[PDB]
Amino acid sequence: IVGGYTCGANTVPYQVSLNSGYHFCGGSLINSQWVVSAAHCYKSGIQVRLGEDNINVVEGNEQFISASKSIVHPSYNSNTLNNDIMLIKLKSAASLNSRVASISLPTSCASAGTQCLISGWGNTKSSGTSYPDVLKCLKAPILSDSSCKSAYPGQITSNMFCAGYLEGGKDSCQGDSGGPVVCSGKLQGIVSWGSGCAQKNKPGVYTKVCNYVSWIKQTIASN
Numbered sequence: 385i386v387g388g389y390t391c392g393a394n395t396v397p398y399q400v401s402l403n404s405g406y407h408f409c410g411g412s413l414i415n416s417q418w419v420v421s422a423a424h425c426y427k428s429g430i431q432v433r434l435g436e437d438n439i440n441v442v443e444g445n446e447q448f449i450s451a452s453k454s455i456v457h458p459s460y461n462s463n464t465l466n467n468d469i470m471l472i473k474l475k476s477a478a479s480l481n482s483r484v485a486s487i488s489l490p491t492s493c494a495s496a497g498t499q500c501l502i503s504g505w506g507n508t509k510s511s512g513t514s515y516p517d518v519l520k521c522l523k524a525p526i527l528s529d530s531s532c533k534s535a536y537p538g539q540i541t542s543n544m545f546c547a548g549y550l551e552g553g554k555d556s557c558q559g560d561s562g563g564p565v566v567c568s569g570k571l572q573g574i575v576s577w578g579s580g581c582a583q584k585n586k587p588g589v590y591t592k593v594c595n596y597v598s599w600i601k602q603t604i605a606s607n
């Protein structure tokens with residue numbers, strides 16, 4: 385996260401870190417046994433870490449659970465990042481409490497102007513490299529489809545929205561990928577892509593979760 389603030393320990397209780405010997409992606413807990421992330425975050429050997437603040441220090445609220453199965457969206461296209469969404473099932477259920485909690489799926493899509501919270505352990509600089517140990521937070525609005533498409537001509541599908549600031553300076557970044565965009569208590573987005581980080585006229589692009597609720601719910605019910 386560039387230009388954000390220190391969230392505070394366990395103030396974002398649905399936030400997960402995906403670990404393959406090191407943090408490599410974010411995710412969201414959507415029930416006791418399932419996590420949602422980006423498809424471009426796919427790898428084999430994933431451990432899910434819940435209850436994290438400092439990802440380098442065991443502080444006492446953590447749950448570390450292996451993934452049993454990963455499911456990349458059937459129509460994921462790694463060239464265009466269309467359908468950039470993946471489900472991860474945990475080997476056993478997490479224990480849910482005030483500090484580890486699931487986030488609700490939307491019943492309807494959010495519109496431009498809604499304010500949202502974006503969170504993660506990704507890079508904090510736009511020019512150069514500095515990875516935080518503690519979770520960072522950013523309040524950002526959803527942008528119009530028209531400003532989104534104007535920023536990235538020929539690149540935005542119906543499964544994508546932009547959020548952020550056209551003036552630059554505040555954005556998600558490398559290492560935030562797969563993490564949550566939550567708006568009015570519902571998961572509306574997944575951190576997906578962008579050109580650089582926090583560049584002017586280049587906002588963040590997010591997977592539009594409300595398009596995938598049917599797939600998520602049917603997939604969970606059958607697996």
Ligand SMILES: [Ca+2]
Nearest residue numbers: 438441442443
């Ligand atoms: Ca920790």
